[PDB]
Amino acid sequence: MKRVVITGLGIVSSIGNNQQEVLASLREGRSGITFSQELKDSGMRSHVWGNVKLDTTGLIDRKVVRFMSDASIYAFLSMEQAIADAGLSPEAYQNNPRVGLIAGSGGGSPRFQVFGADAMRGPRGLKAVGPYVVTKAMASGVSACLATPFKIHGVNYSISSACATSAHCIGNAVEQIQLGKQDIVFAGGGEELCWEMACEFDAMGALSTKYNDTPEKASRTYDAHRDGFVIAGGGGMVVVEELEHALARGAHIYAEIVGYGATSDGADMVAPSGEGAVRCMKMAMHGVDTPIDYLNSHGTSTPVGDVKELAAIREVFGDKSPAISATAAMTGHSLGAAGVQEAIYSLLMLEHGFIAPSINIEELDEQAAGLNIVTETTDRELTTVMSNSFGFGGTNATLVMRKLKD
Amino acid sequence: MKRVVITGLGIVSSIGNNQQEVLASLREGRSGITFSQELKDSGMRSHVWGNVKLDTTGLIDRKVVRFMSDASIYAFLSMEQAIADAGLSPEAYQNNPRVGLIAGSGGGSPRFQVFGADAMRGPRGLKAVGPYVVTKAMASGVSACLATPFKIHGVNYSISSACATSAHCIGNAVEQIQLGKQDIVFAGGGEELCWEMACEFDAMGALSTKYNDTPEKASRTYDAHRDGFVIAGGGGMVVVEELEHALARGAHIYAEIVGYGATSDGADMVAPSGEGAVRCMKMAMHGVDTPIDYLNSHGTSTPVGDVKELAAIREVFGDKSPAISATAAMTGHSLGAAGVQEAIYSLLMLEHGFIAPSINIEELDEQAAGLNIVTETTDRELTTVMSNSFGFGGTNATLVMRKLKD
Numbered sequence: 001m002k003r004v005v006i007t008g009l010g011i012v013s014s015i016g017n018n019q020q021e022v023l024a025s026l027r028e029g030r031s032g033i034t035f036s037q038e039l040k041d042s043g044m045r046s047h048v049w050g051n052v053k054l055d056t057t058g059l060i061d062r063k064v065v066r067f068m069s070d071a072s073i074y075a076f077l078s079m080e081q082a083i084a085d086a087g088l089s090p091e092a093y094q095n096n097p098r099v100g101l102i103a104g105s106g107g108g109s110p111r112f113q114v115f116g117a118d119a120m121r122g123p124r125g126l127k128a129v130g131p132y133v134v135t136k137a138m139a140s141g142v143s144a145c146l147a148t149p150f151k152i153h154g155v156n157y158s159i160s161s162a163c164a165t166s167a168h169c170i171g172n173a174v175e176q177i178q179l180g181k182q183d184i185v186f187a188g189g190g191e192e193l194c195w196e197m198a199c200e201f202d203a204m205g206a207l208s209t210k211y212n213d214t215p216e217k218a219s220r221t222y223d224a225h226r227d228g229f230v231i232a233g234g235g236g237m238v239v240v241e242e243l244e245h246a247l248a249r250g251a252h253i254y255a256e257i258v259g260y261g262a263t264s265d266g267a268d269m270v271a272p273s274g275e276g277a278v279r280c281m282k283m284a285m286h287g288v289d290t291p292i293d294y295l296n297s298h299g300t301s302t303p304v305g306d307v308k309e310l311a312a313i314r315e316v317f318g319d320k321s322p323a324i325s326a327t328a329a330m331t332g333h334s335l336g337a338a339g340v341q342e343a344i345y346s347l348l349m350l351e352h353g354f355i356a357p358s359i360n361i362e363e364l365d366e367q368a369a370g371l372n373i374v375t376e377t378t379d380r381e382l383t384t385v386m387s388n389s390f391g392f393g394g395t396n397a398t399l400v401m402r403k404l405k406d
Numbered sequence: 407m408k409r410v411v412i413t414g415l416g417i418v419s420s421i422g423n424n425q426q427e428v429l430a431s432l433r434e435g436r437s438g439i440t441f442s443q444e445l446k447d448s449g450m451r452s453h454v455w456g457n458v459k460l461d462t463t464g465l466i467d468r469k470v471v472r473f474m475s476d477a478s479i480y481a482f483l484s485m486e487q488a489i490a491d492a493g494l495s496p497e498a499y500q501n502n503p504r505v506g507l508i509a510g511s512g513g514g515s516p517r518f519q520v521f522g523a524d525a526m527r528g529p530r531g532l533k534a535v536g537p538y539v540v541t542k543a544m545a546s547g548v549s550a551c552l553a554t555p556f557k558i559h560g561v562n563y564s565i566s567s568a569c570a571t572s573a574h575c576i577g578n579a580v581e582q583i584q585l586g587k588q589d590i591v592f593a594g595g596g597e598e599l600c601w602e603m604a605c606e607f608d609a610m611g612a613l614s615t616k617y618n619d620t621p622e623k624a625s626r627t628y629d630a631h632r633d634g635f636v637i638a639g640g641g642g643m644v645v646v647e648e649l650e651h652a653l654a655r656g657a658h659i660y661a662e663i664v665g666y667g668a669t670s671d672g673a674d675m676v677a678p679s680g681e682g683a684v685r686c687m688k689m690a691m692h693g694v695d696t697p698i699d700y701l702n703s704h705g706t707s708t709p710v711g712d713v714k715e716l717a718a719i720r721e722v723f724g725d726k727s728p729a730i731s732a733t734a735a736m737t738g739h740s741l742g743a744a745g746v747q748e749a750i751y752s753l754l755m756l757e758h759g760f761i762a763p764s765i766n767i768e769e770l771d772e773q774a775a776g777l778n779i780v781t782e783t784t785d786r787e788l789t790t791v792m793s794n795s796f797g798f799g800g801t802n803a804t805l806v807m808r809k810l811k812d
């Protein structure tokens with residue numbers, strides 16, 4: 001079939017507003033977690049989050065941004081970055097049936113959905129709601145709000161799968177190219193950050209609550225004292241392109257997507273079975289004749305999740321386990337945007353030959369012994385990398401990226 | 407080059423709780439629209455909707471339904487029907503890596519999102535929210551809540567694209583089979599019905615408001631006096647299966663999916679360009695050398711939308727325009743669930759050899775002159791049918807289904 005590569009990337013995360021700032025953070029093992037007065041004031045127990053430190057005011061045309069929620073905004077900015085980074089101009093990607101977009105979010109826009117209901121219940125009713133809430137709150141917001149202004153004519157929809165959302169978007173973009181339907185597909189996603197959505201995770205005891213006094217230490221994947229993930233927001237976009245098309249235009253190729261796994265646990269609603277992850281990674285590794293040098297785990301810093309994934313990793317690789325680090329210990333978990341942002345962190349590590357450190361591991365978990373968990377920025381010539389993304393509903397996604405021969 | 411067929415269906419709509427009840431409604435041109443005190447009490451101008459006339463209490467295991475919102479419930483029930491209709495036993499589709507599920511909703515669950523925020527702001531805070539709001543409100547709720555209890559091991563995620571959602575879910579399912587990755591994929595979707603979501607549409611003037619005293623006449627696609635669509639809820643699911651696999655087990659085949667189109671307008675955020683729909687239908691018709699005997703239009707009864715689609719149809723078929731009817735005039739528009747429900751209506755028409763009437767046309771719009779809009783139930787031996795689905799963000803989907811030879 002057709003080979004697929006990544007020729008551009010864009011990102012807005014808790015550790016950087018572009019790939020340069022992100023690279024700097026990854027290398028330094030810098031945390032993007034800060035104290036949130038908003039979460040505290042809402043009555044939550046978790047008072048920390050991975051927020052985007054950027055004033056998006058006036059960065060998007062007024063007539064365009066009026067239909068957008070934060071998830072769409074973060075993704076839109078990420079896409080602008082990706083387009084430039086890919087060296088693409090309007091004449092090449094706009095009004096072109098061979099160019100599409102697949103990007104989504106985990107929950108659309110809880111903030112505007114609540115805004116809509118709150119306004120409607122007010123004395124002005126419909127007049128207070130306004131005519132822009134639907135595009136801001138609908139689940140497809142991220143794809144709709146980008147495909148329209150960027151004049152995309154190809155495929156256009158969002159894939160949603162909880163914390164695996166943007167990982168499946170990328171995988172599906174790869175499939176569109178392998179099917180020969182598209183030459184280029186912008187893939188990724190975004191997720192807003194707000195108490196409206198965060199309080200639901202706190203309500204199920206999934207968020208960290210014992211480290212509010214020391215925010216940068218809250219997310220501590222694999223640490224024996226971890227107590228839940230740190231919610232984060234942001235966006236990310238990658239330019240997925242057919243190999244010949246990319247070579248023909250002299251594009252800059254970060255890596256080739258040589259593996260994509262998507263499976264289902266068919267077990268628990270909010271807990272991983274591990275069995276699904278094993279099949280997902282094996283699927284992504286099928287046909288890959290090179291060993292996995294680095295593995296960017298899902299590792300959101302949860303008691304069960306963290307170790308369940310490691311057990312799955314041991315089952316897949318056995319004794320030949322790759323180097324592992326959970327970037328979430330620095331950035332927090334951006335839910336729907338986690339898949340693309342982590343794929344990007346992995347691509348930056350591959351591009352710059354280094355392994356980001358898995359921070360805040362003061363006491364390694366016993367069930368994490370016998371594995372190579374990197375806790376310090378390590379320079380190394382990586383060739384093949386793997387990134388895992390798991391979401392509620394037993395949904396699993398795995399991406400394997402490899403450098404292209406010279 | 408795998409061929410794909412539909413071997414089972416399930417549905418919960420405003421016009422029936424199973425395929426038999428729906429068949430009867432379609433043949434009788436019976437409206438599923440009723441007056442809604444809920445919408446009126448909320449302060450809306452639109453007081454009509456296509457509600458599901460069924461008490462779902464106790465129809466799903468307590469431990470399972472606790473994680474579900476209405477969209478998931480409708481889809482779940484639809485899937486139970488589809489499984490039985492397809493004649494699939496547990497050991498045939500469960501714990502099987504070759505069996506997946508792709509289903510979504512247009513907006514997850516506005517009701518539970520608002521519920522969570524409301525509860526959180528109350529005197530009980532987190533305790534009032536409970537630990538089940540995330541799985542109910544997340545955009546992937548429909549796929550997550552079904553893949554888990556049905557023991558799905560293959561693909562598992564939701565495709566979301568506003569009012570084209572379930573149509574893209576079906577198309578993606580076809581793609582998974584064509585890629586040889588799955589032998590069976592349950593595809594479809596669901597959408598809850600509530601003022602929390604409906605008021606947002608009324609706020610942009612998209613819903614009918616001039617026929618509240620005569621509910622069954624509110625949805626009137628192609629009528630010169632149409633004034634917006636009638637919001638509806640419900641679910642639908644179809645069993646997408648590889649041909650050889652279906653034949654081998656002696657499955658009942660409704661039709662083969664011979665065409666699937668998915669395009670983007672790249673124009674207006676909440677209005678169709680028409681140009682995108684032309685490309686979508688043409689894409690779905692590629693290689694289809696049989697004429698379209700019946701076209702189930704998106705036709706949601708909107709001023710601009712109704713005629714824009716007819717213009718696109720004229721451009722695609724020219725002087726060879728097919729018989730057309732908008733089932734939405736009877737059922738209302740179920741948003742994310744519309745795609746699969748309309749594909750099911752089309753399959754029932756194909757299976758039973760008849761064309762459902764496009765009701766409530768008291769005065770045909772002038773821009774619809776010269777077309778074959780069926781306004782009376784008409785028996786006819788159909789062979790190839792087409793169904794269109796369009797959504798905000800300029801997202802387009804078209805499905806073409808054809809009876810298998812003998």
Ligand SMILES: *C(=O)CCCCCCCCCCC
Pocket residue numbers: 105106107110161162163164196197198200201335336390391392539540541543544545
């Ligand atoms: C990751 O799998 C955990 C679940 C994330 C679901 C997406 C975010 C849902 C927000 C709306 C519900 C609060």
Ligand SMILES: *C(=O)CCCCCCCCCCC
Pocket residue numbers: 113116133134137138139512513514516567568569570603606741742796797798
């Ligand atoms: C169809 O294209 C019109 C848009 C449908 C969106 C359905 C989901 C909306 C959820 C958010 C409402 C404020």
Ligand SMILES: [N+]
Pocket residue numbers: 296297298342387388389
């Ligand atoms: N990851």
Ligand SMILES: [N+]
Pocket residue numbers: 702703704748749793794795
């Ligand atoms: N349709």
